[PDB]
Design an enzyme around this catalytic site. Structure first.
Site, short mmCIF file in Angstrom:
data_model
loop_
_atom_site.label_atom_id
_atom_site.label_comp_id
_atom_site.label_asym_id
_atom_site.label_seq_id
_atom_site.Cartn_x
_atom_site.Cartn_y
_atom_site.Cartn_z
N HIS A 242 0.80 -1.22 0.00
CA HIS A 242 0.00 0.00 0.00
C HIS A 242 0.84 1.28 0.00
O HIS A 242 0.29 2.38 0.13
CB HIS A 242 -1.00 0.02 1.17
CG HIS A 242 -0.38 0.21 2.51
ND1 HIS A 242 0.11 -0.84 3.26
CD2 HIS A 242 -0.13 1.33 3.23
CE1 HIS A 242 0.63 -0.37 4.39
NE2 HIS A 242 0.49 0.94 4.39
N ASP B 283 -0.17 -7.62 2.03
CA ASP B 283 0.37 -6.28 1.92
C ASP B 283 1.90 -6.30 1.92
O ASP B 283 2.55 -5.91 2.90
CB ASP B 283 -0.18 -5.44 3.07
CG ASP B 283 0.19 -3.97 2.96
OD1 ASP B 283 0.46 -3.49 1.84
OD2 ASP B 283 0.18 -3.30 4.03
N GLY C 224 3.44 6.55 8.74
CA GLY C 224 4.79 6.89 8.35
C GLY C 224 5.72 5.71 8.57
O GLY C 224 6.83 5.68 8.03
N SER D 256 4.66 2.51 7.96
CA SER D 256 4.31 1.47 7.00
C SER D 256 5.50 1.03 6.16
O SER D 256 6.38 1.82 5.84
CB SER D 256 3.21 1.95 6.05
OG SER D 256 1.94 1.95 6.67
N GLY D 257 5.50 -0.25 5.81
CA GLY D 257 6.56 -0.81 5.00
C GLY D 257 7.79 -1.12 5.82
O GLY D 257 8.66 -1.87 5.39
#
Ligand code: NA
Lengths: 53, 223
Positions: free
Chosen positions: B40, B84, B175, B177-178
Site C-alpha cells: 500500500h 500487503d 509513516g 508502513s513498509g
C-alpha cells in the site's frame, strides 16, 4: 475514546474537530495532506489527499 | 513509532526510507539490490534512501538509489490489506558498510511471545501529530493469533500477525508502513495497519513475512 471540542468521544468514537463519531482505522503510511475525507467526513483508511481538504 | 526510544546511530543498518519528494514509507534491505516493503506504499516513482539516521539532514553516509522495478504481490487486496507486501529492485547495487546492511529472511515463523524490534520515522504522538528526525525504536512481542483476531474480529487473515501491547501506549503509526519488524535477526513483519496508534486492545497489525519467502526468492530470481 478522546476529548473533543465541547464533547468527549467514548469507546468506539473518533473525534472530528468538535463532534464524536466516524472511526479512524487506517494504514500506516504518511499522507502529505492527510487521509481522504469526502462527502461524509473524517478520513479514509488507505488513501491520502493529493490536494488538501 | 509511539512510545519508543531513539535508535542509536546506524543501529538499524537494514532500515530504509522510501522517498518521492519526501519520506512516505519505510522498508527493509534484504540484499544489496532488493528492498521489501508494504504494497500500500506503492508509487510509480520511488527513490530509496539508505544509511539514513536523521531524515531531515544530509549526514554524508546516505546512499540515494532510484527503484528500477516495483513489484506488488499479485494477490494484494486494497480493502483488507491482505498480502500487503512489495518488492523493490534498486537500479544500482547498494554499497554495504556498517551503516548499510541487509537483514535475514525468516527460516520459520516467530512464536507468540517472541520479542521483536520495530523501527521507523513515523508519527510519535498517539493523540496528536509529531514526526521525528531521528529513527525511533520499539521492542514488542508477537501476540497470539487468537488475541490478534479478538482484537480485530473479521479482519485478521492468516497472512497477518499482531505485534504490540493490548494495553496500548507503544505502537507503530502513520509513516512507519513498509517498515521492519525483526526478531532474532530475522525479518518477521512489515508495518501494515491498525486502528489508530497505541489504542487499548488495538495493537498494530503486520504482514506475516514468513509466508512469502518462496515468493520473494522466486521473484528476485526472475528479475
Ligand atoms: Na540523514
Amino acid at each position: 475514546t478522546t476529548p473533543c471540542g465541547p464533547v468527549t468521544c467514548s469507546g468506539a468514537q473518533m473525534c472530528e474537530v468538535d463532534k464524536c463519531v466516524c472511526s479512524d482505522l487506517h494504514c500506516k503510511v504518511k499522507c502529505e495532506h492527510g487521509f481522504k475525507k469526502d462527502d461524509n467526513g473524517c478520513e479514509y483508511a488507505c488513501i491520502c489527499a493529493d490536494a488538501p481538504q | 513509532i509511539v512510545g519508543g526510544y531513539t535508535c542509536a546511530a546506524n543501529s538499524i543498518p537494514y532500515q530504509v526510507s522510501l522517498n518521492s519528494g519526501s519520506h512516505f514509507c519505510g522498508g527493509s534491505l534484504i540484499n544489496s539490490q532488493w528492498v521489501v516493503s508494504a504494497a500500500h506504499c506503492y508509487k510509480s516513482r520511488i527513490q530509496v534512501r539508505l544509511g539514513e539516521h536523521n531524515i531531515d539532514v544530509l549526514e554524508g553516509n546516505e546512499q540515494f538509489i532510484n527503484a528500477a522495478k516495483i513489484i506488488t504481490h499479485p494477490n494484494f487486496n486494497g480493502n483488507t490489506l491482505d498480502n500487503d507486501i512489495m518488492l523493490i529492485k534498486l537500479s544500482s547495487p547498494a554499497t554495504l558498510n556498517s551503516r548499510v546492511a541487509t537483514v535475514s529472511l525468516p527460516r520459520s515463523c516467530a512464536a507468540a511471545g517472541t520479542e521483536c524490534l520495530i523501527s521507523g520515522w513515523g508519527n510519535t504522538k498517539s493523540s496528536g501529530s509529531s514526526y521525528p528526525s531521528l529513527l525511533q525504536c520499539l521492542k514488542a512481542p508477537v501476540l497470539s493469533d487468537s488475541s490478534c483476531k479478538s482484537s480485530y474480529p473479521g479482519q485478521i487473515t492468516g497472512n497477518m500477525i499482531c505485534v504490540g501491547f493490548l494495553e496500548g501506549g507503544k505502537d507503530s503509526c502513520q509513516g512507519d508502513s513498509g517498515g521492519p519488524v525483526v526478531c532474532n535477526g530475522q525479518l518477521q513483519g512489515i508495518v501494515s495497519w491498525g486502528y489508530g496508534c497505541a489504542q487499548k486492545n488495538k495493537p498494530g497489525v503486520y504482514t506475516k513475512v514468513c509466508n512469502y519467502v518462496n515468493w520473494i526468492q522466486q521473484t528476485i530470481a526472475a528479475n
